[PDB]
């Protein structure tokens, strides 16, 4: 997660058990796939704010591997259009999207990815 306390530079934190727990429960509450999952998934991506890396390692321990693995290879793919059309303070010279989009520093860039990583889910 990114926390953003006031009147401070932002800062990445691993994971905690307990918040991975917590999202599993609520995401848990609602039918795989359906609008209201979707709902209480990027509910969870607002609350604390991922990184790419962040999304990936949320994914592996809510989902099967092979789940998670098919949404990763989507998200390859409409990250390779995204790419294509150009993205929001994503600049190719300085590095791989997934990469960048896990610098805390870079937001912009990291909400665009989150959408991205949302709209895999289809």
Same mark, same amino acid.
């Given at each position: 997660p990114v926390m953003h306390p006031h009147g401070v530079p932002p800062s990445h934190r691993p994971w905690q058990m307990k918040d991975l727990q917590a999202i599993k429960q609520e995401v848990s509450q609602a039918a795989p796939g359906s609008p209201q999952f979707? #709902? $209480?998934i990027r509910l969870a991506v607002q609350q604390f704010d991922? $990184?790419?890396k962040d999304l990936q390692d949320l994914l592996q321990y809510l989902? %099967? %591997?092979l789940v998670a693995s098919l949404h990763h290879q989507q998200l390859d793919s409409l990250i390779s259009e995204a790419e294509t059309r150009g993205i929001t303070g994503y600049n190719p010279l300085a590095g791989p999207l997934r990469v960048?989009?896990?610098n805390p520093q870079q937001q912009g860039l990291r909400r665009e990815y #989150? #959408?991205?990583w949302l709209t895999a889910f289809a």
């Open positions: 979707m #709902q $209480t991922p $990184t790419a989902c %099967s %591997s960048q989009a896990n #989150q #959408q991205l």
